[PDB]
Amino acid sequence: SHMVPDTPTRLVFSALGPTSLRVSWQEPRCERPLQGYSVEYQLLNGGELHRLNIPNPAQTSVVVEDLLPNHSYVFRVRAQSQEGWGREREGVITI
């Protein structure tokens, strides 16, 4: 039922200046060892797909840079096990 990781907990956003933030979550349940996370983010109204891969399940935060002021973004965080990638936790924010 949770061989691939469950969804992470709700995303917490912390502003770090005008073009950066910290995105944070908590480690999701999994019946298999967690291998890491992906953080995918994209302008709400369209743009390039950005991805940060975090190969350590103990790191549940990351600093995201070069964001556009006054623009809205969709962040999607997933965790990986040997069984595959789990469902995303989605959170949105305006910079």
Author numbering: 1454 to 1548
Please quote the authors directly.
Integrin α6β4 is a major component of hemidesmosomes that mediate the stable anchorage of epithelial cells to the underlying basement membrane. The β4 subunit only pairs with the α6 subunit to form the α6β4 integrin, which is a laminin receptor required for maintaining the integrity of epithelia. The third and fourth fibronectin type III domains (FnIII-3,4) of integrin β4 mediate binding to the hemidesmosomal proteins BPAG1e and BPAG2, and participate in signalling. The crystal structures of the individual FnIII-3 and FnIII-4 domains were solved and the relative arrangement of the FnIII domains was elucidated by combining DEER with site-directed spin labelling.
The structure of FnIII-3 (1457–1548) was refined against data to 1.60 Å resolution. The asymmetric unit contains two copies of FnIII-3 that are almost identical. After superimposition, the root-mean-square difference (r.m.s.d.) for all main-chain atoms between the two molecules is 0.59 Å. In our crystal structure β-strand A extends to A1468, similarly to as observed in other FnIII domains. Y1494 and Y1526 in FnIII-3, which are phosphorylated during signalling, are adjacent in the structure. Near Y1526, one of the FnIII-3 molecules has a sulfate ion coordinated by E1501, H1503 and two of the waters in the cleft. This anion is of interest because sulfates frequently mimic the phosphate group of phosphorylated residues. In the other FnIII-3 molecule in the asymmetric unit the position of the sulfate is occupied by the carboxylate of D1519 from a neighbouring molecule in the crystal. Collectively, the pocket near Y1526 has a propensity to bind negatively charged groups, despite being surrounded by the acidic residues E1501, E1518 and D1519. The sulfate near Y1526 in the crystal structure suggests that FnIII-3 might tolerate phosphorylation at this position.
